[PDB]
Amino acid sequence: LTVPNIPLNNLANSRVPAMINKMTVSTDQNQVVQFQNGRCTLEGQLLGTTPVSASQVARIRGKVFSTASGKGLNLTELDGTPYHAFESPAPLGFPDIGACDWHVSTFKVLSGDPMSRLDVKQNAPFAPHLGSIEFTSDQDPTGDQLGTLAWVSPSTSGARVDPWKIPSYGHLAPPIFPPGFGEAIVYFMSDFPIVSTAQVPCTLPQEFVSHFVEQQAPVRGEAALLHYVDPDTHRNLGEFKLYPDGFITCVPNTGGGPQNLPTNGVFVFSSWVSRYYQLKPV
Amino acid sequence: QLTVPNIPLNNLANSRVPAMINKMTVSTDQNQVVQFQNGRCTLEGQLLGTTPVSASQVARIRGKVFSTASGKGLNLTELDGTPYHAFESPAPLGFPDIGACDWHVSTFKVDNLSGDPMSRLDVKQNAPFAPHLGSIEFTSDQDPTGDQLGTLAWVSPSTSGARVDPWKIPSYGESTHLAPPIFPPGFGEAIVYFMSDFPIVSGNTAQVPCTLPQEFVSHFVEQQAPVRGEAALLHYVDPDTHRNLGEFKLYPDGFITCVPNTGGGPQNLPTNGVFVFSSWVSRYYQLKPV
Ligand SMILES: CC(=O)N[C@@H]1[C@@H](O[C@@H]2O[C@H](CO)[C@H](O)[C@H](O)[C@H]2O)[C@H](O[C@@H]2O[C@@H](C)[C@@H](O)[C@@H](O)[C@@H]2O)[C@@H](CO)O[C@H]1O
Ligand SMILES: CC(=O)N[C@@H]1[C@@H](O[C@@H]2O[C@H](CO)[C@H](O)[C@H](O)[C@H]2O)[C@H](O[C@@H]2O[C@@H](C)[C@@H](O)[C@@H](O)[C@@H]2O)[C@@H](CO)O[C@H]1O
């Protein structure tokens, strides 16, 4: 097993199309998350709606159809092949930013302005598991539309967007529980236009996901001990544990944590360790 | 030891636009020379041109809005906001390389958002287009200010009568330190182009070619493998049956070739195959047609 030999700031977010710009721990270190993207086991098994490429993250494709009030999308996979309402929560790569309006910029798969912005609410007709969502748009999209989540905003006036939530979809990756004993889940944060924190967290950089899928490495221990290394001085900046279920922890120093580390370090696999191997605080 | 990504073609990203690869092809003129600045990396992991590491850096722009007596522009930075220094690159890393057309780039202001946060920056590749020196002019129907970060959304012709040719690169300048041209390397070989659907208005097709899938680029950067021959022989393999569907050569300078059958080529291959490194071979190794 290896992890990507790529500095953190050259890694992509796995929940929105953006680069990672810092790490952090949650304000409540017992907080449980259940992100559906950026989920993959160390052996390379994708979970939830997680796709392989950073260019599949938080994208939607579907055929426009007429609903009672306007238009909707009958979803397909991003490659245009049919979506089958089966075991996954939604088509692969479907956004997982819950409890907010989405604004998705799509094109018809040209003359004039080719873009449509689809404004999607997560209310009753939002049924991505079944394969359909509704939208309003100031443009006139028709046919086969492919696009990318552009920004998010509150579901109702006065509400706030919490990008730590996931949608109700109508094989949902399981919750990630802080494993105890002072360890805290490490979240990888990206700037992203959120109207009304304005950073989106994820639990694995996208290139970690493709790395695990590509490598199909056997898991040889209860956790993988990683070092976060300065690529210029080659000094070890901190210890992290990578768990088989596909998330990373550290022991954050009180009043601090991985948010105080440089954002240009490289994670390097060091050794397999037991589940209760104690980390040096960071 | 050199490997290539164990990822099927349809799960690979384009290295010139933010899109997934949906097929391979060869150019209609098989002697056509290209000089793309993104998707460029040697087998030893040396990035060339403006090529970034991540698929989510591809064809993106960041900069600070400034005004002139005549209009507005962006003073470019790198995508992480750090200063862009004109040195040995054509532009900031990840900067689009779709030449000779108007660009339409959707940006947001980095940091307390209210209302519609997006601005569409309309960029012309005329005189004020000087990304190598670190600035471009734009017009916009919105009101972007401050630190704007965004992604190429679509492209359209420079003039009314014109077409978009996504096989061209910009004029970045003046010496701009371009990644060198890629010539078809002889022995009946044709460069393999990886295509993605993308909104090109008034292109002959709505597709953008690139010469390396983006995950190949990051793979080479990570691996930092030594080059041990004049070319790497690859097989394109069906992941279910494990059978070899065709021979390809991967060159040290960072591109892939095949010998296409007359009237055909890799465009006729299934799109769910995986490239696998086979062996190092001589420059003169003659490929079986595909
Ligand atoms: C449909 C539409 O055009 N709505 C505009 C408002 O934005 C909507 O806000 C609601 C919640 O209030 C919801 O997020 C929709 O998805 C938004 O499209 C707009 O409100 C202003 O901008 C919003 C994004 C909101 O977040 C806030 O910034 C502000 O109230 C109003 C005001 O210009 O115009 C509406 O047309
Ligand atoms: C500034 C503007 O919005 N102009 C509209 C034209 O779009 C511009 O076309 C020029 C080239 O003529 C260039 O591509 C700019 O980037 C565009 O913004 C528009 O042209 C029509 O739509 C274009 C996207 C393109 O498909 C063109 O072939 C087509 O004629 C014209 C016509 O609607 O209106 C202009 O106001």
Automatic annotation (TrEMBL), chain B:
Q: Report if keyword Ribosomal protein is assigned.
A: no
Q: Which domain of life is it from?
A: Viruses
Please provide the record's keywords in A-Z order.
Answer: Host cytoplasm, Virion
Q: Where is the Calicivirus coat protein C-terminal domain?
A: 76-290
Give a Gene Ontology cellular component term annotated to this protein: host cell cytoplasm
Query: Where does the UniProt annotation locate this protein?
Result: Host cytoplasm; Virion
Protein name as it appears in the record: Major capsid protein
Organism from which the protein derives: Norovirus Hu/GI.7/TCH-060/USA/2003
Q: What is the lineage of its organism?
A: Viruses, Riboviria, Orthornavirae, Pisuviricota, Pisoniviricetes
Q: What range of the parent protein does this fragment cover? A: 231 to 525 of 539
